[PDB]
Structure formats: structure tokens, C-alpha cells
């Protein structure tokens with residue numbers, strides 16, 4: 018009807034159609050703390066909100082009022098809950114409400130309440146048809162929006178919309194191969210579709226990741242993904258990988274590569290590798306290099322790893 | 333060594349320049365943003381160095397105190413966005429004062445108790461302000477604030493019978509909790525529930541059935557924990573997950589090796605502070621959410637007999653974190669912040685200080701080892717890494733409530 022910023026906006030206390038209900042002031046007590054000196058407009062809306070809440074008035078006027086209360090503080094989860102009570106009670110058009118939440122999220126994309134409200138609507142409608150495109154628009158503005166990714170994961174899993182997500186992941190990795198949210202989505206899609214037990218899939222993934230590392234060797238996300246998809250079977254189960262990394266070491270001795278070597282050596286020692294004394298020596302040398310030179314921010318961690326190796330494998 | 337009036341800093345070592353981002357000549361939004369922050373931070377670091385003269389760093393306690401004291405009574409309409417978070421303002425401010433060892437006048441303490449009573453819902457739990465529905469986040473904040481006050485008056489505000497019923501009313505069959513009635517699920521709720529239930533002695537055998545397993549499902553391939561299963565590892569949700577498991581004595585449900593490697597990786601080699609997720613920017617509040625994981629991991633590993641654990645240091649760069657907070661996160665007007673160029677707020681004041689205290693104080697068994705960077709007055713009161721209130725307050729509250737029965741249960 019009329020928005021809070023509109024030139025013709027009128028305070029609820031001045032609206033004839035609200036004259037029959039008394040506003041309910043907030044009681045902060047006789048000696049208030051963390052007391053917010055509200056604007057007149059804010060207090061007016063919330064005094065009337067408290068009134069309709071207290072009376073449990075399930076009306077169209079109350080519904081319109083929640084829209085204003087939300088604009089004033091979209092983190093007010095009490096208002097959101099009441100708005101949902103009204104959506105059901107008044108049998109409001111949920112597609113119209115979807116248009117509303119779409120606009121609100123675009124304005125406030127980091128807010129928990131707006132995303133939860135959208136999920137409730139999609140659940141009520143059992144209609145995911147606008148979701149992937151809407152989320153992609155939000156992600157086009159902030160490609161790391163945690164709420165947007167979480168909602169995307171929910172929609173895909175709940176409505177089984179897996180078919181195009183790896184292609185979407187690939188597009189976003191082309192745009193920013195350092196986008197850790199997208200590497201996480203890659204794992205999400207593959208683990209939930211083919212899995213990584215298919216040796217052809219794992220090889221494709223290892224190859225792809227090694228290629229990304231070659232292109233951008235100081236990108237931590239690709240290194241973490243490489244470890245992520247190999248770690249549960251055990252890094253030492255992949256003997257060729259060690260050789261390949263060892264070849265790159267002299268020319269690409271980044272802390273990420275050196276750390277990865279230690280991780281391999283750790284797992285090797287845990288699995289009765291051949292030449293244990295030699296492998297232990299090499300691992301301790303790398304821990305020292307990391308602690309003293311290549312990764313000094315993590316000196317305490319690398320010193321711990323060195324002591325841990327010795328506690329487990331010295332013999 | 334050096335005269336007492338000069339203290340060399342890690343971030344000012346000549347080799348520290350080697351820690352600047354290497355973008356491999358491949359620019360993306362991520363690297364561009366990271367480089368911009370590093371450039372600003374280098375400018376800041378340099379401002380604290382005068383060739384071989386490096387004056388001791390100073391926590392501006394008095395400025396922070398005045399900012400906090402003012403916020404505890406009154407706020408402009410600029411704070412309307414926190415109108416459903418007033419118990420948070422109470423907790424962030426009281427905990428900051430507590431860390432700074434600034435006494436809370438009895439009158440202020442009573443007024444806070446009275447206000448939090450008004451935020452308590454008849455259905456149990458606390459809401460964001462008087463008459464608001466309850467929600468686990470302001471419930472956590474209110475309970476923590478009342479424990480910081482720590483008077484019998486404060487403790488007795490809490491309606492424990494209704495609190496327990498309220499937690500039940502949020503508990504899902506899969507072990508998770510809603511944040512509020514009809515609200516969203518993520519690992520925040522497990523921590524809020526576990527924190528308030530353990531402090532107030534209302535844990536039943538069934539309350540947390542399945543919860544540890546659900547939290548473990550939130551640990552992902554990176555080794556950290558996401559908000560729900562499948563999601564990206566995030567320092568805030570990781571703190572929530574591990575802290576809840578520590579309360580439940582179920583830390584072993586996680587892969588602690590991958591968790592430890594993930595969190596230590598989140599300390600930024602150049603800035604010295606922590607990022608919340610891999611390949612995102614440094615932020616002062618993660619001084620708590622990330623660095624606070626290290627004392628939790630230490631306790632967990634120590635419980636398992638780990639013979640390699642340090643007896644003197646947490647497994648992060650304690651000095652570097654202190655340098656980032658003291659040089660980059662203080663507002664000259666009082667208050668602390670995310671990073672240079674950002675504006676102060678009470679949330680960053682709370683968590684920057686909490687992280688500073690973790691970085692200054694190591695304790696395990698009978699071993700205590702302090703590393704207070706800068707002037708000795710910089711030393712803060714210790715904070716409990718599970719609850720993030722003083723350990724004295726935790727012991728006092730837990731002792732008080734353990735004398736009361738679990739509501740309706742034996």
C-alpha cells in the first residue's frame with residue numbers, strides 16, 4: 018500500500034483504520050539498559066506490532082503492518098514468525114509472497130531470517146522452480162554468500178536438482194578458482210551423485226585439481242581439495258602422487274606443496290611403509306623447514322607434528 | 333636482548349615481507365581483495381616501527397572502557413538494527429568489561445538483571461527484547477551475561493524448568509536443534525543449547541541424544557565444520573561444533589587431526605589475524621572463533637594422552653595474533669573492529685578482546701605460561717574457551733546450579 022520511505026506515509030497512530038486498537042508500548046523497566054532511542058517511525062510501527070501480537074489479531078491490516086516492521090528491522094525473528102502465522106491464517110497467495118521475499122533478500126542478502134522465510138515458502142509450495150536462478154543472481158553479486166550456498170544445497174538435495182550443478186561449479190571456478198565456496202560445492206555435488214569410489218571419477222578429479230594447482234600454485238583451495246578427496250583412503254595409498262609432487266618440489270617449493278609432502282609421509286609411517294627411518298627423517302626435515310622458514314606462522318603446529326611423528330615412529 | 337622500552341615484533345621482521353600474497357600472476361576477485369588488505373596492513377605495521385626503535389604496543393583500556401560504559405545504558409537509533417538482539421549487547425559489553433577487569437557497579441548489575449528478566453519468555457528462554465519470542469541466541473547471551481554478573485539475584489532470574497522445556501521444544505529427531513520455534517537449523521543451536529543447559533544444570537540423558545553425531549556430520553572435507561552437513565568449513569560454526577562437543581564430552585566424534593590442520597591454516601601468514609574461511613579476508617572477531625579452537629583442541633588431545641602436546645603454548649602464533657589485534661583492530665576513539673577502515677561495534681570489541689586474552693594466556697594442568705605482548709598493563713583477565721566468560725564465573729555458576737535438581741528429573 019504505502020512504504021516507510023514514501024512521501025505519503027502516515028504513522029499508524031494517525032491512521033483512521035487503526036483507531037480502534039490501542040498501541041502497546043515497550044516496557045524497558047524503570048532503569049533501562051542498552052536502551053535504543055528509537056525514531057518516531059520505528060517506535061510507532063513497533064507499538065502497533067506489539068498490539069496486534071498481544072491480541073493475536075490475524076488480519077490483513079496486521080499482515081501489512083509486518084511488512085513495515087520488517088523494513089525497520091529485518092532481523093526481528095518475532096515479526097517474521099507472526100507474518101508466517103498470518104500467511105497461513107489468511108490463506109495469502111504464496112507466489113506473491115515469493116516475489117516479496119525475492120526483493121527483500123536482494124536488499125539484505127546476509128540475513129538469516131529472509132533465507133529461512135524463503136525456504137519455508139518453497140517447502141509450502143513444493144515449488145523449487147525459481148530457486149537455482151534466483152540464487153545464481155545473489156551469487157553473481159557475492160560469490161561467497163554463505164546463506165545463498167546453504168539454501169542452494171538444500172534445494173538441490175531436497176528436490177533432486179543435481180543435473181546441472183557440476184557445470185555451474187565449473188563456470189564459477191573459471192571466474193575465480195580461489196573461491197573456496199565453489200570447491201566445497203564441487204565436493205558436495207560429486208559425493209552426492211557418482212561418489213568418489215568410482216576410480217575413473219577420482220582420477221578425473223585428481224587430474225583436474227593438479228591442473229588447477231599448476232595454473233595457480235599458491236591457491237590454497239585446490240591444495241585443500243586434493244587432500245580432501247584422498248585423505249580418507251589415506252594419502253599414502255597413492256604412490257604416484259608423491260613422485261609427481263617430489264618432481265615439482267625443486268621448482269615449486271611452496272608451503273602448500275611441502276605441507277602436503279609431510280601429510281603423505283605421516284600417512285606412510287602410519288601404514289608400515291618401507292624405509293621407515295628414511296621417511297621419518299625426511300618428514301622431520303620438512304617440519305623444521307616449515308617451522309623455521311616456509312610456514313613460520315604455524316611454527317607451533319609444525320613443531321607439534323615433528324614431536325608427534327617421533328612419539329609414534331622412532332623405534 | 334633489548335632495553336625494556338623497545339620490543340621487536342614478528343610482523344616487523346625484514347623476512348616478514350616474504351609473506352605477502354603470491355598471486356602467481358593470475359588475478360581473481362579473491363586475490364585482488366586480499367592484496368588490498370595486505371597493502372593497508374603493511375602501512376599500519378610500518379607506522380609502529382621507527383627503524384630500530386619499536387615502542388611497546390598499548391591496549392587503549394581507558395578508551396575502550398568509556399565506549400563500553402556508555403553503550404551499557406543508552407544507544408542512538410543507529411542501533412535499531414539490534415532491537416531484537418539486546419541481550420547480545422548486554423553480553424558483549426559485560427564480557428568486554430570483565431576482560432578489561434573493570435568493575436560492574438552494583439546498580440548497573442541490578443538493572444541488567446531486571447532488563448534480562450523482562451526479556452525472558454513465559455515459555456522459557458530469552459528473546460531479543462521485552463515481549464519478543466524466545467530464541468537460542470539471546471538465550472545464550474542472557475545466560476552468559478547473568479553468569480558474568482554472578483550474583484544470586486542474577487542466577488535466580490533464570491526459569492530453569494521452562495528453559496528445559498523450551499530446549500525440548502526445539503530438539504529434532506536427527507539430533508539437531510531449531511534456533512527458535514518454527515526457525516532455522518544449524519550448528520549454532522547445538523552450542524547455544526549445550527552452553528545454557530550445562531551452566532544451569534538442566535541436562536537430561538535424552539536432551540542431546542544424537543546431537544554429537546549430527547555435529548560430526550557437519551565436519552567436512554576441509555576438516556573444519558559447516559553450519560549444516562555439506563556446507564563449507566567456517567570458523568564460527570566450527571567453534572560452535574567443537575565447543576558443544578567438549579560440553580558433551582564427545583570431541584572424539586570428530587577427526588581432530590583434520591580439524592587441527594584446518595584451523596591452524598586459518599591464521600594469515602601476513603596479517604597475523606585469522607580468516608573465517610579459506611581464501612577469505614582477515615577479521616578481528618575470528619581472533620576468538622578460530623583461535624579459541626586451539627585451547628579446545630589442546631584439552632581434547634590432552635584427554636587422549638597425546639605425548640607431543642606443548643606444555644607452554646597453544647598451537648597458533650600467539651604473538652602474531654596479538655600484533656594484529658593491537659596494531660590493526662583498535663579504534664582510536666575506543667572499541668575494536670574487524671580490520672582497519674571498518675567501524676567499531678560492540679561485537680568486535682567483545683571478540684577481539686576475547687581472542688587477545690586467549691593469545692596471552694596458556695594453561696594446561698598445573699602449567700601456566702603467559703605471553704603478554706607490549707606494556708604489562710595489556711594483560712587481560714582469562715576467558716573460558718567453551719563459554720567465553722571468565723573461568724571464575726563458570727565455576728561459580730556451575731557450582732551454584734549443581735545444587736539445584738534437574739527440573740522434573742532424577
Ligand SMILES: Cc1ccccc1S(=O)(=O)N(CCN(Cc1cncn1C)c1ccc(C#N)cc1)CC1CCN(C(=O)OC(C)(C)C)CC1
Pocket residue numbers: 469472520521523524567568569572615617621670677678679680
Ligand atoms: C561469527 C559467526 C559465528 C557463527 C555463526 C555465524 C556467525 S556470523 O554469521 O559471522 N554472524 C556475525 C554477524 N556480524 C557481521 C560480521 C562480523 N564480522 C564481519 N561481519 C560482516 C556482526 C554481528 C554483530 C555486529 C554488531 N554489533 C556486527 C557484525 C552471526 C553472529 C550472530 C550472533 N552470534 C551468535 O549467536 O553466536 C553463537 C552462535 C556462538 C552463540 C555471534 C555470531
Ligand SMILES: OC[C@H]1O[C@@](CO)(O[C@H]2O[C@H](CO)[C@@H](O)[C@H](O)[C@H]2O)[C@@H](O)[C@@H]1O
Pocket residue numbers: 208245248249548549550551552553554555556585586587590591
Ligand atoms: O575432515 C575429514 C573428516 O570429517 C569427517 C566427519 O567427521 O567426514 C567429513 O569429511 C568427509 C571427507 O573427508 C566427507 O565424506 C563427510 O561427508 C564429512 O562429514 C570424517 O569422516 C573425515 O575423516
Ligand SMILES: [Zn+2]
Pocket residue numbers: 615616617618670680
Ligand atoms: Zn568480524
